[PDB]
Structure 1
Amino acid sequence: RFLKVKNWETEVVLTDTLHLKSTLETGCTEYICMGSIMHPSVATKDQLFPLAKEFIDQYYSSIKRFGSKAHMERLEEVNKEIDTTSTYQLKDTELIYGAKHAWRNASRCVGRIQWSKLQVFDARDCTTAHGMFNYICNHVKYATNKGNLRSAITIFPQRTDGKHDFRVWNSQLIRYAGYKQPDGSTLGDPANVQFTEICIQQGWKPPRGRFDVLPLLLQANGNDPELFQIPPELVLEVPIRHPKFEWFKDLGLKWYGLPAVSNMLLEIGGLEFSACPFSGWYMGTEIGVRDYCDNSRYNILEEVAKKMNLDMRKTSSLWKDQALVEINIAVLYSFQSDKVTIVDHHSATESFIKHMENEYRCRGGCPADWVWIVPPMSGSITPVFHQEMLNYRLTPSFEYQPDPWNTHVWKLV
């Protein structure tokens, strides 16, 4: 079997064979498509054996040693550990490879042209929340690199019995607090009101401002999580100004330079790494469209349009559209002026298409989630909009997991 995807802007046709090697479901059926569902859908010995064999087989194929003496010894060895300890340990090489291919297989990530330049930080010797904080500070300092951002991931010990998970309770390493006021308004980031509340309850003393970097809430070995303040000199931030509108800086807007997702699960050969924060650099629309202009977020369209004296009486004036562009210009100009790595949605989508074509050529395909790949503004004037894409799930993979406060059984009376 083969499957073809077409680009309707260029008429290039690519041929996907890679999809024959997927195994978990997409959520779709033969008669319903669920491609716009945000979230559709511990292993025993018997379950873990084929998953591990699959990953060891593919690792040894990648390094052109399939069938080798070392491949067969490794399988034997992995299998002893699963027999003995009901789990196994990855070699460093396997860990690095698995982490890179989890990124390579992330169908919703438009930045995957960079997948093989991932700095893997092995933190599987960590045993405490203090330890995790140390590991995470070093990640932040390395990744941030004074504005010249570098891709990086820090991998904490894998799940065991489900009762000793390592977790970063934060959704990202750097995020701003949100506070709901008695009058119903919201200060800061409305997305983070719940996590802000858990922080305050755990003992965080909030300054209660618009851009309070939240504390880290770190859980090691199934214990209660603990609070740590990131050293402020490690949180690189960019004040948002506009190259034309002198008044823009008066909005008091700023954002952090480092996007670092910390709530996902890294799955490699059946092993579950439940704490594995990873970071790259921003595409501008993530800030200027979603973070700033989602109605459920900082929601600054009306403010910005006001200062543009746009006619906000009718929607067909496209005042929101006009204000959205200017905000996103300001984001890109601000990061660039401060020499903090950022990519605009045109460059990023163009690069993703080159990456996708190369992946079809060298690998037999590239799973891609159109719904997520297309930027949230100016969709059809980017090339990915006109690109057909096959979405399927390959492993190693990044996966969502339950928020830890919906699951954690608290220790301290």
Structure 2
Amino acid sequence: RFLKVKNWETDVVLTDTLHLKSTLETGCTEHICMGSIMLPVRTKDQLFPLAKEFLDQYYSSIKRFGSKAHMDRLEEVNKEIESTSTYQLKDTELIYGAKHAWRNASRCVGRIQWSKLQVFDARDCTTAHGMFNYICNHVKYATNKGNLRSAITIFPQRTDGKHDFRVWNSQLIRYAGYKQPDGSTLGDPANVQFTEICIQQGWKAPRGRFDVLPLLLQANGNDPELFQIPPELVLEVPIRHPKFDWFKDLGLKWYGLPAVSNMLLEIGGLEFSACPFSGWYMGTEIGVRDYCDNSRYNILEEVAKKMDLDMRKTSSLWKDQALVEINIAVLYSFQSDKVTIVDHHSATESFIKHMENEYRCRGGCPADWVWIVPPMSGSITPVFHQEMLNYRLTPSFEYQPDPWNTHVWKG
């Protein structure tokens, strides 16, 4: 069956046939839509079909579907599963899989880039120290002195789920949060709980507004260990505004490298529980969410205070006014320092072109509208007007619960 999507600004109509390869469930039914819900040990039995399915896709992609090379590999994976209860991906399959998990990430507006991804194979890793070294190399390679390059590092897969590799940090680079006795927070309020564990684990906290957290790393199901990323590896940008000279005196900065470390990569039925990836920022992630969420740095009042805005009625749109200037500043600062960044206009336009190309080549592009639309100026970006179909393809990236709720402490 065919499904259509309309763009209401252009009347372009696209046809989705790809949704027919979708296995996993959405959380939605014919009676309820859960499109805005943030969150809506394997057997031999269930593994070979998922392996088979994936290898069929891989072999099609490289135009060898049905070849002797394809059949032999099905055979070989077959045997490995019956004998060992799992299997190992060839390099070429890991690369392809990691790329396709990004291609299939419906919440990611950055996917025009999906085919340029540096895959770092770290399946030979055995210790947290080893993980640390692999992660440092990732950071240095991705950062590339401000000319950011997309990369992912893939640590060994789940075996019995008693031996998981996990990166406890939600991103490789993030600032500490310190809840004070008066109830105010110092630094990033999102990271308070994680900061507390780091400190409990022996970290000596500087206790300022922008202290880069230590990595907390779990290898082979062991208790995790602290490591400080070398500071010369952590590229940071001080935030200033092109016209407002007082902006720098707010004392803001942000890190250049967005690097998601808490997700689970699934390929051919195997689960990679530590697979930190990175690209570059869209300016709104920092300027809207990180700086302006009430539960984050929450700088709207102080910025509007300094801009002498009428702050006595919401209808002066003082919040909206300060929001734009902060986002101007973020982009200005990154650009002035030659750190890769993309504005939300450019990102969404690029994404619409990617989406259209995907419909032509692939028969679809799963997209989560709730996430794709930027969190400022929604309707002046072309994605606002774009109907999207959301569905789940594998390979995929999935959220996993924070590991401190699940970890069996060895002591």
Same-fold status (TM-score > 0.5):
yes
Question: Could you state the TM-score of these two structures normalised by the residue count of structure 1?
Answer: 0.99
- Report the Cα distance in structure 1 between the residues aligned to 2:409 and 2:4, rounded to whole angstroms: 51
Once the two structures are superposed, residues 344-379 of structure 1 have per-residue CA deviations (whole angstroms, 9 ceiling, x without a partner) of 000000000000000000000000000000000000
Give the superposition deviation at 1:185: 0.4
**Equivalent residues in 2 for 1:2-17, closer than 5 Å:** 2-17=2-17
Deviation, structure 1 residue 387: 0.3
What do the CA deviations read for 1:171-228 (whole angstroms, capped 9, x no partner)? Answer: 0000000000000000000000000000000000000000000000000000000000
Superposed displacement of residue 402, structure 1: 1.1
1:317-347 CA distance string (max 9 Å, x none)? 1000000000000000000000000000000
Q: Distance in 2 between matches of 1:186 and 1:246?
A: 27
2:226 match: secondary structure: strand
- Aligned residues: percent identity? 97
SS of residue matched to 2:257: coil
Deviations 1:71-114 (A, max 9, x none): 00000000111001000000000000000000000000000000
- The match for 1:187 is 186
| Distance in 1, Cα, partners of 2:7 & 2:401 | 37
Alpha-carbon distance between aligned partners in 2 of 1:235 and 1:346, rounded to the nearest angstrom: 27
**Equivalent residue number for residue 39 of structure 2:** 39
Tell me the residue number matched to 1:123.
122
Q: Report the Cα offset of residue 406 of structure 1.
A: 0.3
Show the counterpart of 1:311: 310
The 3-state SS of whatever aligns with 1:348 is helix
| Displacement of 1:407 | 0.6
Shift, 1:230, TM fit? 0.1
SS at match of 2:205: coil
For residues 348 and 29 of structure 2, the distance between their equivalents in structure 1, rounded to whole angstroms, comes to 29
How many residue pairs end up in the alignment?
Answer: 410
The CA distance in 2 between the partners of 1:327 and 1:117, in whole Å, is 31
Distance (whole Å) between structure 1 residues aligned to residue 97 and residue 175 of structure 2: 31
Distance in 2 (CA, whole Å) between partners of 1:367 and 1:109 is 10
Whole-Å separation in 1 of the counterparts to 2:94 and 2:324: 41
State the distance in 1 between where 2:122 and 2:83 align: 24
1:157: how far off?
Answer: 0.1
Give 1:43 shift. Answer: 1.1
Equivalents in 1 of 2:285, 2:393: separation in Å? 25
Q: Which ranges of structure 2 fall in alignment gaps of 5 or more residues?
A: none
Q: Deviations over 1:95-151 (max 9, x none)?
A: 000000000000000000000000000000000000000000000000000000000
Is 1:361 matched with 2:360?
A: yes
1:286 Cα offset (Å): 0.1
Cα shift at 1:269: 0.6
Alpha-carbon distance in structure 2 between the residues aligned to 1:94 and 1:30: 37
Structure 1's consecutive aligned runs of 4 or more residues displaced over 4 angstroms after TM superposition are none
How many angstroms apart in 1 are the aligned matches of 2:403 and 2:312?
A: 44
TM-score, normalised to structure 2, is 1.00
**CA offset at residue 311 of structure 1?**
0.9
Distance, in Å, in 2 between the alignment partners of 1:199 and 1:48 is 37
CA distance in 2, matches of 1:350, 1:340: 21
Q: 1:36-70 CA distances to partner (integer Å, 9 max, x unpaired)?
A: 00011x21000101010000110001000000000
Q: Once the 2 structures are TM-superposed, how far is the Cα of residue 31 of structure 1 from its aligned partner?
A: 1.2
1:261 corresponds in structure 2 to: 260
Q: Tell me how far apart the structure 1 counterparts of residues 127 and 30 of structure 2 sit (CA, whole Å).
A: 46
Distance, in Å, in 2 between the alignment partners of 1:358 and 1:198 is 45
| Structure 1 residue aligned with 2:372 | 373
SS in 2 for 1:154: strand
Paired residue secondary structure (1:267): strand
1 CA distance for matches of 2:350 and 2:216?
35
The Cα offsets for residues 211-262 of structure 1, whole Å up to 9 and x where unpaired, read as 0000000000000000000000000000000000000000000000000000
Distance 1:84 1:130 in 2: 31
Q: How far does residue 30 in structure 1 lie from its aligned partner after superposition? A: 1.2
Write the distance in 1 (CA, Å) between the matches of 2:42 and 2:396. Answer: 16
Q: Distance in 2 between matches of 1:356 and 1:243?
A: 34
Task: Give the corresponding residue for 1:108.
Answer: 107
CA distance in 2, matches of 1:11, 1:332: 32
User: Structure 1 CA distance, aligned partners of 2:270 and 2:29?
Assistant: 27
Once the two structures are TM-superposed, the CA of residue 403 in structure 1 deviates from its matched residue by: 0.6
